[PDB]
Design a binder for this molecule. Sequence first.
Ligand SMILES: CC1=N[C@H]2[C@@H](O1)O[C@](F)(CO)[C@@H](O)[C@@H]2O
Ligand SMILES: CC1=N[C@H]2[C@@H](O1)O[C@](F)(CO)[C@@H](O)[C@@H]2O
Ligand SMILES: [Ca+2]
Ligand SMILES: [Ca+2]
Ligand code: NA
Ligand code: NA
Lengths: 640, 636
Amino acid sequence: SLQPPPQQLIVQNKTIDLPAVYQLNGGEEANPHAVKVLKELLSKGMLISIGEKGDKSVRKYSRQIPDHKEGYYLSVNEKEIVLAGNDERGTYYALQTFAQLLKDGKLPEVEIKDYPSVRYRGVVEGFYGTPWSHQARLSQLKFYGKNKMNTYIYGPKDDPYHSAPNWRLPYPDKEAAQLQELVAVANENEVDFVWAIHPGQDIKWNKEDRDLLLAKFEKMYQLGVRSFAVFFDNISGEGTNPQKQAELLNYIDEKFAQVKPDINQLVMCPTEYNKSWSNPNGNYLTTLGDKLNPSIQIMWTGDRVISDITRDGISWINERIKRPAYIWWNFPVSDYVRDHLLLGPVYGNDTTIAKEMSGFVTNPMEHAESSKIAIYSVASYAWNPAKYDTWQTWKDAIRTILPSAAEELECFAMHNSDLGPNGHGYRREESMDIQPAAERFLKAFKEGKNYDKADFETLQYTFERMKESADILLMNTENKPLIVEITPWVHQFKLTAEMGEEVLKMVEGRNESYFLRKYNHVKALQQQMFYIDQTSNQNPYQPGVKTATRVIKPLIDRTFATVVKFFNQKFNAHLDATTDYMPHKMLPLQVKANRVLISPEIELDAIYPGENIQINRLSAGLQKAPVKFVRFQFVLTIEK
Amino acid sequence: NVSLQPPPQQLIVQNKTIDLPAVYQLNGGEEANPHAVKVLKELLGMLISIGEKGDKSVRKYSRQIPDHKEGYYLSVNEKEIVLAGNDERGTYYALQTFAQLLKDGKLPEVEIKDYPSVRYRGVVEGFYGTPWSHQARLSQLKFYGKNKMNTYIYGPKDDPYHSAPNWRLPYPDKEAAQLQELVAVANENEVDFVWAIHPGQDIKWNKEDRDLLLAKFEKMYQLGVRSFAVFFDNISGEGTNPQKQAELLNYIDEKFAQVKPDINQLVMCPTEYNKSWSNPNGNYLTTLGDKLNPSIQIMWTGDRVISDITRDGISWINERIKRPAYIWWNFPVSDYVRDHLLLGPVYGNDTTIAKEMSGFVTNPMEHAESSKIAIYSVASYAWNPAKYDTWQTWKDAIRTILPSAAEELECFAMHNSDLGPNGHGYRREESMDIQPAAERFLKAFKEGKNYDKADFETLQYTFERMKESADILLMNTENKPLIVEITPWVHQFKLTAEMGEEVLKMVEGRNESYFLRKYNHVKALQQQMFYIDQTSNQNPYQPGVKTATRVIKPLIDRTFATVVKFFNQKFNAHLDATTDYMPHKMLPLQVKANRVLISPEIELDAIYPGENIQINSAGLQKAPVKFVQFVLTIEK
Ligand SMILES: CC1=N[C@H]2[C@@H](O1)O[C@](F)(CO)[C@@H](O)[C@@H]2O
Ligand SMILES: CC1=N[C@H]2[C@@H](O1)O[C@](F)(CO)[C@@H](O)[C@@H]2O
Ligand SMILES: [Ca+2]
Ligand SMILES: [Ca+2]
Ligand code: NA
Ligand code: NA
């Protein structure tokens, strides 16, 4: 099992032992990064040959080495091992494949000829929210090397030295030193560190700003950076002028990229960066495609801000930019649904269009470890799209990331995949396995027919498995940083499962007293879920923690409200059928941070000092006046 | 169909009820104890007569009023309501009883003659650890009033203005204003605020220290304090001299208590304060008995530091001190088992010995609201010991403290009662309901015999109820302070119940794969419990959080170990059967704060700077350490 799967693989069905005595051939001339991996894997003998084509070590294998950048030939048989790159990166990649072949001190007899289908592959740290930590970025870069991703584009929107206004200023010493270590680690792992700049919100089209931009790039070059990007995404005003962006990019190309001895990628992200944002008959994209120097890459997110790449979609862009688009794929980025983790499989992208793209990069979540699921899958897709297997690669990623609890992580991920409704209109599948038992159960229950015991048991099994998975994940110490990222969702996922269990016990409801016990327990679990949703992940945009939102929570919520109705009809009672706990009383009320709002007479659960009120455009300042009751969008802000 | 706590000495009911009056004439309002009138006026033509023996208002009932301090006569019929105390406190107690009779604007037709069997009843806040907050104390004093406790002895061991060396120093302004408020609220609820001082560890038997002590009592008098105590418990050296203690207390009596216009209680706690800590062949207790002025109370905790009061036990002390002991009952105090909550019923004290005690106070937990279970029960016991009903009063206390979730709190409380092993040798029953089903299930299961299905189901129902109770208590907003206190134990108790369920699924078992899932879930739940035990309640003495320790956890653990053993035999496997999570490898290792020890080679889960090693010492100068009583201290 190899990720990414190689272009060609012949397995012979013999085992070889990794040699106890071995003779290394080419160690002094091969890529030192590759040699390093080899010597770490190891400990007159069997010949091992390592090198790039043209090296004496492997020259005789020239006809086996694919004539492709980053290509390699790998061979293991009873007499020798060959590890031969088309180029230095190819040799390194041969080693990353070799490392996966190796199991319990043993190797299969194999022959591999391999190379990437897409030239640039990797990650753009390009989101809004808390930028990745230094430690997370160091862990990312080694993960990229392992999965043959050759590109990391550094551009966190909330880094003030990447965007406005402090893009003009050189990083302070501490950050500068850390960026320098990132570049060293990137180089060692055969990843191009691409430093991007995002200057467009306040850029002036004059000599001063032009010189300041170049001076900043020069400071980055001194730190070791050899690839560069200028991003004009999500800005307004003069900085959106395509003639001027092209001129600036061409000036960078001619005065910097064609002036330093060793600059690699020069990349730009347009302002009209997906089809829906492209002004019809407006010539923004035709100006870039026509004026931009042919070596400069142009990024593109597809037909929408968030979209999967189609053949019709990529033909539409390429005809305009006159070159193959450099894909900026907006998944698993969650910076517009920050209360959701997006841990499902990578899918939706046409697997036959590798020739139509210059690069394919993924914009990930602010949760770095959790993003490795999709990242590993994108690595797989971009290297060998023709053999890309969505579900197997998802499972492979999970087993790679958390071998000691892969099935528990699979369980958690399967039910934390969808985005919920959103302004981008982008959705993913979730909980599809149990979705037929769910829909069957609910249809039968609601209308008045008997449900199938099997479906009920299926639901029971799932909640049971959810609780097992949550508790095992919380205490897993194999990848602590991943567990730190996901813990709030994990707690919420567990409460979801327990709630499911108690609602199911209500459905059976042996008797009146047992029913009420179950009902009160459920009310308490709803309160607990509210508490997590108000105290975890309290960001300004989508605060809180949602989980299992597509199929499971709605099923539990609907079953609860239905069985409560049935109890009230039967026992002539008046139990509260509401499913989301709300401390305040009044369309449902909502609490977001220090706001209390009616979904587009309120009595708060206490006296708070008020700040202001907004109603639709009406507003009034409250000036800290004590408030418990309010009586007339509809939003109250309070000091909380 | 009336529940009264404490239960009155005498009660006659009629099985007729009368409505509380819309229009009523009040007689005696201006002359009765204002504290009682206020209660009556808040609780609100038909005659209502309120007053003390001697008032014109209660003249008709003078012979019905018991001739006891704090006694009262209370009567309700269709014609009139009578609330007549032998004295001012009595009238107030009449009202506290009246308040409980009142239900939904309705009163039962009743006649009550009542009085306490023990003169002084209440609480000594006399433990080590975090003193009760000011808000907690305000709540307590109000609770004492409702339950006819007339004594609050203030003596937190870790108040530096109470014990050494700063007993000599007057309270700073902030604290003094707080104590002043505590005294006002005490006075309003008919509680004697008794300020104690703990000077004996460094007292000098000279004029300088005697005057500083008297000067401190004078400052407390200016704050409104009118009852006083000197404690000599848990000290060594010259301060343990009984002649000098007696002389000092007598000086306080003669120059201060007998000189002020209105001082009430003067109380001392001896150095020999329980039989085990006394020398039968020494002169200490006989010197106090002979020399101490007869109005001075002497405290006693029983046969041991922690003990219940017996007839033989109190006889032994009374004969030596020449007066009835003022009991200092060491329950529910948990300052020596700080990882446990003690929420069980009050029991074990002889109910026939009221005449042999001048007082009975409870030394509670540092958890003030949680202590109200025992405090309510002590109030009931001390007022009417003849009628003291252990379990009904426990139930009554819980329903009083947490009416919105009484059954849930009962469940939590019944399994959080015992102290576990300790140096004081004091234990309490716990989980007695399910104990026989547990014991049978385990004996059967261990020896390869079939267990009763009913016992298995009893255990399942228990775990299920524990989970309902835990989640409901966590979210309860009726008594937020109680919930704050118990929350870490509530989390640990939920974990316990989940672990039990999963272990029982292992016993049902089904197939290999399902068993393994259950087993892995159990390991995860053990680690979670360890995390709570290492992160919550990290005090220097008994850090962490233990719950359901006497019966429920041992059962879960022993069942886990057994079923793993059988799985290993059946499948030729080597699953780990150990029942507490331990991250360091080695007899169980233990982790307490930054200490790693072998229960009376070690590989830690990481490199740590080492502090020292103790075996039964060598400092480690912060050297990096991963491999090494037997206690390793590290930096954490
Ligand atoms: C090219 C592009 N820039 C924005 C935009 O897409 O949407 C996002 F990708 C998703 O919100 C955002 O993270 C990114 O910074
Ligand atoms: C009279 C007495 N003083 C100590 C002793 O008993 O034990 C305790 F009551 C329990 O350890 C302690 O709280 C108290 O301060
Ligand atoms: Ca070479
Ligand atoms: Ca009077
Ligand atoms: Na103090
Ligand atoms: Na409290």
